[PDB]
Design an enzyme around this catalytic site. Structure first.
Site, PDB file in Angstrom:
ATOM      1  N   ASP A  35      24.622 108.984  67.246  1.00 44.04           N
ATOM      2  CA  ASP A  35      23.819 107.866  67.726  1.00 44.04           C
ATOM      3  C   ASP A  35      22.758 107.436  66.704  1.00 44.04           C
ATOM      4  OD1 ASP A  35      22.512 106.039  69.267  1.00 44.04           O
ATOM      5  OD2 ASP A  35      21.567 107.505  70.595  1.00 44.04           O
ATOM      6  N   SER A 199      19.770  89.918  60.594  1.00 45.97           N
ATOM      7  CA  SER A 199      20.984  89.177  60.317  1.00 45.97           C
ATOM      8  C   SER A 199      20.626  87.736  59.967  1.00 45.97           C
ATOM      9  CB  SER A 199      21.932  89.221  61.521  1.00 45.97           C
ATOM     10  OG  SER A 199      23.031  88.335  61.341  1.00 45.97           O
TER      11      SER A 199
END
Length: 330
Positions: A35, A199
């Protein structure tokens, strides 16, 4: 040093991936969920409330010659999905794909919430976010990657998740045969303890790319792609019959639909998520309505580039002094 381990989907939807990890002496092999959105290595164990264990493989520290109890130490964690676990703390020898860390904090569960009990395939978690999120008290402990870092040939690990297939976690090297073209690297903020990046925009299907900054985290421990409501609405508007369902808990669509791809920007580069990756199957057994793999992050507080996004790429987690993320197509 380096390590290389295969990671395998737990079910036919790629809900999560498990990676075998050797703990203790003689080795006890448990299948952990790696994770990058948390920083605790915790396991089902001989100390876990018996009624909360249902099929998992447990760590038994009393059978390990290298286990040591961290006196007085405790841990307690809650995840984005509302699941939680807690317990006490050992150190032990931990190996992943040939890479060994001695004195790794192995957090032994005394209590786990129902979703963990109900998932027999996941024996624990291995956190790969920054050690500042580790929940051990009174003294925070380091992640496996943090402990391994100085020994590694290069201070990196990579995630190469498969679509309905196994993939790979590598430590300490970049497999240049595992991706196409070049890796584009982008800046990371560690201010919140995550692999947080921005992004450069998105496209829906064959549409023109929309240049727009989207802050989010690279999170292998989250199944789906969670993005701003504007972005997600623009995506599902291109799917005939799609709608947001409050009763189901997100966007659903006719299982017979052909889903468009979804593109996200990494600097001037582009990662294309095929439409099929975005299908998470019937909302319930036998339904002709299917659940979408791109959902709104509104109410989470952060955007999450989970497995739906990450499995479309070869992803470098660069833990150099100034960390960065790299993405390549594959």
């Amino acid at each position: 040093s380096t390590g290389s381990a295969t990671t395998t989907p737990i079910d036919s939807l790629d809900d999560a991936y498990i990676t075998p990890v050797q703990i203790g002496t003689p080795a006890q092999t448990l299948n952990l969920d790696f994770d990058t959105g948390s920083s605790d290595l915790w396991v089902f164990s001989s100390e876990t409330t018996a009624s909360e264990v249902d099929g998992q493989t447990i760590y038994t520290p009393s059978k390990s010659t290298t286990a040591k109890l961290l006196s007085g130490a405790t841990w307690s964690i809650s995840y984005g999905d509302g699941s939680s676990s807690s317990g006490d703390v050992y150190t032990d020898t931990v190996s992943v794909g040939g890479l060994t860390v001695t004195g790794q904090a192995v957090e032994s569960a005394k209590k786990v919430s129902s979703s963990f009990t109900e998932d027999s395939t996941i024996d624990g978690l291995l956190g790969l976010a920054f050690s500042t999120l580790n929940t051990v008290s009174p003294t925070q402990q380091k992640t496996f990657f943090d402990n391994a870092k100085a020994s590694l040939d290069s201070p990196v690990f990579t995630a190469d998740l498969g679509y309905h297939a196994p993939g790979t976690y590598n430590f300490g090297f970049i497999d240049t045969t595992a991706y196409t073209g070049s890796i584009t690297y982008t800046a990371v903020s560690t201010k919140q303890g995550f692999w947080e990046w921005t992004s450069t925009g998105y496209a829906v299907g064959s549409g023109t790319f929309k240049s727009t900054s989207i802050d989010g985290i690279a999170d292998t421990g989250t199944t789906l792609l969670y993005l701003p409501a504007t972005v997600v609405s623009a995506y599902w508007a291109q799917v005939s019959g799609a709608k947001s369902s409050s009763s189901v808990g997100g966007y659903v669509f006719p299982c017979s639909a052909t889903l468009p791809s979804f593109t996200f920007g990494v600097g001037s580069a582009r990662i294309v998520i095929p439409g099929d990756y975005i299908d998470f199957g019937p909302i319930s057994t036998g339904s002709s309505s299917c659940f979408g793999g791109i959902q709104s992050s509104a109410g989470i507080g952060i955007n999450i580039f989970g497995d739906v996004a990450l499995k479309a790429a070869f992803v470098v987690f660069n833990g150099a002094t100034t960390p960065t993320l790299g993405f390549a197509s594959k």
